[PDB]
Design a protein around this nucleic acid. Structure first.
Ligand SMILES: [Mg+2]
Ligand SMILES: [Mg+2]
Ligand SMILES: [Mg+2]
Ligand SMILES: [Mg+2]
Lengths: 159, 292, 169, 204
RNA sequence: GUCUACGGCCAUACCACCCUGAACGCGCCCGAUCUCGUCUGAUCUCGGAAGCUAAGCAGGGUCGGGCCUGGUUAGUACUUGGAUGGGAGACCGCCUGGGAAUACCGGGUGCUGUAGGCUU
RNA sequence: AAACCUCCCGUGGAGCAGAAGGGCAAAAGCUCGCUUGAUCUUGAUUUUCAGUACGAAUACAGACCGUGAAAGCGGGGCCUCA
RNA sequence: ACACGCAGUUUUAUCCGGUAAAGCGAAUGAUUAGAGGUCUUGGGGCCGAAACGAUCUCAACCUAUUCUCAAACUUUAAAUGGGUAAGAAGCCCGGCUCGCUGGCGUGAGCCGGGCGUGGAAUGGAGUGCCUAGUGGGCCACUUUUGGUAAGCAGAACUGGCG
């Protein structure tokens, strides 16, 4: 059986990438995290304090509490029967903003603009997204040149 | 010979440090603690007073840090002193005190708190702190950023700090490193500090050198002989400079214009020129080789 | 017409390596204080060696560094002892050189039954103005590529300044 | 003495080389991986004759040594002592284990029994280079060496010039234009990315 | 066009050698009474402006190394799902989708925020 | 070849008590100066988990402090067990 | 004649990994052979009293190459896979409270007002009490550990017998 070590199996997970060791860049230290902000957790081996557990690496959660240099994040975790919404304390260096919600926010702003606009025009615009439709039948023009033949290549042993 | 330490693999695995670290300008270990604000505020700037004593100038600035880059909210320079009266001695303790006072007064004038928090007008050298007055906007708070300077007793960064705190800025500090503290007695004299603030050390050296050797006096204080500044006039010159600084600290940036826009440097060579140059060198070498 | 490329003496290094214990090293330090005029410091052993009779953190040798005109005068005395004779191997590739003297009595120090004969090693560090960049605190940098002292230039400087008679081999 | 090669023919385990963890490994049977006139130039022995396997199996070091001995002996008999160069391109690194029964299957982890080489499909086993007139002798030597190995392997003569990675037809043109510089057993390729001093060293 | 102070991303920014620097600025540099610390004012600290681009520094050059970004390698290696497919097996082909990495060959060799100078 | 001194190169190939892994260069290594945050007290959370204990740890808060010019750091050991 | 909410699904965005592969002319370790090196020193030797004077050789090294590898190596690096988002519990304004933080400011919490189909396709969902039996499993495609192998022992996903 395996040991119950906290950092077991984190040989490469909690390791700085190639030629990116040394001093932690200060941009990550001066980013604010309001309540209700969607945040994805990625552990960093340079900082040992505030280290999240290996099971939360790569997970995404919501910020509910803030301290001097750490925030509280509620992250869903599945334990063999169910998903548990549990809260953990993670330091800032292992915390970055998630870019999944910004696309939705941008689309919401664009939809609000398209709702305020074209309203006095009277023409309803398509606001819902749609999957890729058929490829809109067209014409292919082979001006002059005929299509090139592609015969199979006879086999030869190269090794 | 030797085994070449700097092989191809040496550069392949070489991880350069930060640009400021390579240039030897920024101590990121201290900057992390000086700059970063607590997360539970979410907007409050962390103002710091950066003091850099150059070879022929003193730079005092106040700034807060942002992701795109720290913004300088106010600045003061030692070369601005001749406008206020200090013609010579731009890199002494008194110059640092004057620059700090100028920075503090200019920031207070910009923020509209010029009348409140007048600070210490009668300079004495004792420890002085500015207490916020109830019912009034709070006193400006910032922290001293020494940089890479070795903070010992008598460093001019603390002279700029004393000037700033006398200007009316609430900067947390102690009297340990002010000139006048005794290491062997753990007591502060507060009179030697006034001598250094008023430039009395320079005047004493000037008198001593004039008494000792005339040639050494001429060489050490060649520009002090010009402009007619004497050790007898130093204290009143500095007092008048302080009064003028407190009267009007505003800046009057000159209207730069009329630029010829000429390339003083060397423009970069294009790819085609490089390829043609190497081909021409090959051809010239072939032609010269087919001679002997 | 080089403006600031004149070779100068950065420092002169003097050391005596007695390396047994105590009083002999103290006498060597007395000789160093008599000659250099400054109180020297004691150097401890890096690790224990049984053959040499030394132990870890045991004070073996005493050394002193002299700079300025005093270093020049001490070098004048030491080189006058050596009859201005150096060799090619005595010159290093970094632009520095040195020599040893078997007895310090030739320098001008009276002998004593208690403080007897102690030889010492001289080492001269040459340089140019602007060499303080590599050892200053904030904006440390290397001293160019054409600014460093070469071995042949050090040989010529010694040949001209001290009237060298260096011999091959 | 040792178990039949049928036991350790297939690649069943992960590679198990000799290292800090695996110690006490007996020395491999094959020690000389190339012999003949190995002190020869590229231009004199262009044949590039290869023996390529067709099975993902394991070849024992003893089989490699026996095949090398047989091929070298036949090549010396046919062409001459210094008229060829034979190179073995397989090194036994995988270590097989032996669970010797004088306890049952409890604690069954074998000690290092020997060394074996893992071979992929189409991988070159043995290579011989010599003059063009010895093509029949090369193919006969490789056919004889085939019987010292299990599985099925083919005999092929490639278009490369000797033990080099450049085609024989284009080799002479590259040498004439000094793109290729002979260097011992192999050849050296110089690109145009080098400093002009290196180019100036040649063409003069 | 460019520099100084504080920075952001941390080599397109690094390393080796060579050439050029008008002005401000940055430094070399001149000394140790006062502040300060050393075996040595070498470092640090303080007091200055007689000389200089010698060096740092800035720009440029190397059929330069490295680094960043592309083509080739290659629809190759590998791989999700399928078969009462082949083969004694080892393994392999096909159907349905995804799709690499060396060697080799090209391009480039820092952008930028705040405040303050010079070219007026 | 190994005693001490000097210069240069040196991405860390040394050291950080231990087994190994991760991490660290004006440090987290070496030398100094001062101290005992290895102090007292409520809660919240993380690891195994049944999501129960023990041990270990993580962000806080309330007092007494230490240190540094200060920003800050520290309620034991750089982290993963003792 | 009139739909909220949830999914062993997919799509559009946005994060995570270090396995397959590949590399060792890049780090660590293993390892073959030729060219240039008194780089370094040393053993046998030969021409030499000796000589880094000529010639090779075996030692560990270097300078550009070359053959083969790594479950406890790695610059790169998949397919498959794992988290989130796809709106009413959301946005846009106005005003109050704060023994918190702040130069003015923040930040949070309270009230008032205005704006509704937020990708595809399928399901009606949510919630509370008691509760028996079970707690010896086995087989197969695929991945995989020990063993020569086993109708052998032991793991992962899925499907079956039970
Ligand atoms: Mg500091
Ligand atoms: Mg506390
Ligand atoms: Mg593999
Ligand atoms: Mg049953």
């Amino acid at each position: 059986t395996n040991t119950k070590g906290k950092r077991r199996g984190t040989r490469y997970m909690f390791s700085r990438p190639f030629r990116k060791h040394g001093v932690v860049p200060l941009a990550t230290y001066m980013r604010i995290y309001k309540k209700g902000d969607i945040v994805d957790i990625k552990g960093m081996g340079t900082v040992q304090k505030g280290m999240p557990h290996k099971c939360y690496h790569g997970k995404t959660g919501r910020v509910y509490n803030v301290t001097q240099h750490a925030v509280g994040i509620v992250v869903n975790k599945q334990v063999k029967g169910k998903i548990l919404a549990k809260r953990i304390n993670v330091r800032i260096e292992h915390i970055k903003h998630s870019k999944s919600r910004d696309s939705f926010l941008k689309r919401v702003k664009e939809n609000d603009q398209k709702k305020k606009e074209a309203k006095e025009k009277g023409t309803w615009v398509q606001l819902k997204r749609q999957p890729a439709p058929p490829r809109e039948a067209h014409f292919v023009r082979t001006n002059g040149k005929e299509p090139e033949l592609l015969e199979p290549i006879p086999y030869e042993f190269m090794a | 010979f030797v085994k070449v330490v700097k092989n191809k693999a040496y550069f392949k695995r070489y991880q350069v440090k930060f640009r400021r670290r390579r240039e030897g300008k920024t101590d990121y270990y201290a900057r992390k603690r000086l700059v970063i604000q607590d997360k539970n505020k979410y907007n409050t700037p962390k103002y710091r007073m950066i003091v850099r004593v150059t070879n022929r100038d003193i730079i005092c600035q106040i700034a807060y840090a942002r992701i795109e880059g720290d913004m300088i909210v106010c600045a003061a320079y030692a070369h601005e002193l001749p406008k206020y009266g200090v013609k010579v001695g731009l890199t002494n303790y008194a110059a640092a005190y004057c620059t700090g006072l100028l920075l503090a007064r200019r920031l207070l004038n910009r923020f509209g708190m010029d009348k409140i928090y007048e600070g210490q007008v009668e300079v004495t050298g004792d420890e002085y702190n500015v207490e916020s007055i109830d019912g009034q906007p709070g006193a400006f708070t910032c922290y001293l950023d020494a940089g890479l300077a070795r903070t010992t007793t008598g460093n001019k960064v603390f002279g700029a700090l004393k000037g700033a705190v006398d200007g009316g800025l609430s900067i947390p500090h102690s009297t340990k490193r002010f000139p006048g503290y005794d290491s062997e007695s753990k007591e502060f004299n507060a009179e030697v500090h006034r001598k250094h603030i008023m430039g009395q050390n320079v005047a004493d050296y000037m008198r001593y050198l004039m008494e000792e050797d005339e040639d050494a006096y001429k060489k050490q204080f060649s520009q002090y002989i010009k402009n007619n500044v004497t050790p007898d006039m130093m204290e009143e010159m500095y007092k008048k400079a302080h009064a003028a600084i407190r009267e009007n600290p505003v800046y009057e940036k000159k209207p730069k214009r009329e630029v010829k826009k000429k390339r003083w440097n060397r423009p970069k060579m294009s790819l085609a020129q490089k390829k043609d140059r190497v081909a021409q060198k090959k051809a010239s070498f072939l032609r010269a080789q087919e001679r002997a | 017409e080089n403006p600031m490329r004149e070779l100068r003496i950065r420092k002169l290094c003097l050391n005596i390596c007695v390396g047994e214990s105590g009083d002999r090293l103290t006498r060597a330090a007395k000789v160093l204080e008599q000659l250099t005029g400054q109180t020297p410091v004691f150097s401890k052993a890096r690790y224990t060696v049984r053959s040499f009779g030394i132990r870890r953190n045991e004070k073996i040798a005493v050394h002193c560094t002299v700079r300025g005109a005093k270093a020049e005068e001490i070098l004048e005395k030491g080189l006058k002892v050596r009859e201005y004779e150096l060799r090619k191997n005595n010159f290093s590739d970094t632009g520095n050189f040195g020599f040893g003297i078997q007895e310090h009595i030739d320098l001008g120090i009276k002998y004593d039954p208690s403080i007897g004969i102690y030889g010492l090693d001289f080492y001269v560090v040459l340089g140019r103005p602007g060499f303080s960049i590599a050892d200053k605190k904030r904006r440390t940098g290397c001293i160019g590529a054409k600014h460093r002292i070469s071995k042949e230039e050090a040989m010529r400087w010694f040949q001209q300044k001290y009237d060298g008679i260096i011999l091959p081999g | 003495g040792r178990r039949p090669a049928r036991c350790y023919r297939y690649c069943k385990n992960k590679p198990y080389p000799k290292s800090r963890f695996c110690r006490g490994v007996p020395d491999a049977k094959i020690r000389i991986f190339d012999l003949g006139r190995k002190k020869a130039k590229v231009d004199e022995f262009p044949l590039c004759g290869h023996m390529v396997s067709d099975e993902y199996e394991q070849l024992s070091s003893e089989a490699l040594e026996a095949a090398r001995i047989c091929a070298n002996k036949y090549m010396v008999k046919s062409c001459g002592k210094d008229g060829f160069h034979i190179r073995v391109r397989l090194h036994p690194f995988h270590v097989i284990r032996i669970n010797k029964m004088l306890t049952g299957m409890r604690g069954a982890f074998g000690k290092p029994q020997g060394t074996v080489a893992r071979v992929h499909i189409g991988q070159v086993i043995m290579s011989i280079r010599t003059k063009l007139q010895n093509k029949e002798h090369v193919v006969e030597a490789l056919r004889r060496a085939k019987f010292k190995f299990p599985g099925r392997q083919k005999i092929h003569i490639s278009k490369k010039w000797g033990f080099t990675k450049f085609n024989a037809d284009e080799f002479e043109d590259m040498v004439a234009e000094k793109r290729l510089i002979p260097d011992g057993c192999g050849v050296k390729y110089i690109p145009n990315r080098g400093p002009l001093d290196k180019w100036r060293a040649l063409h003069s």
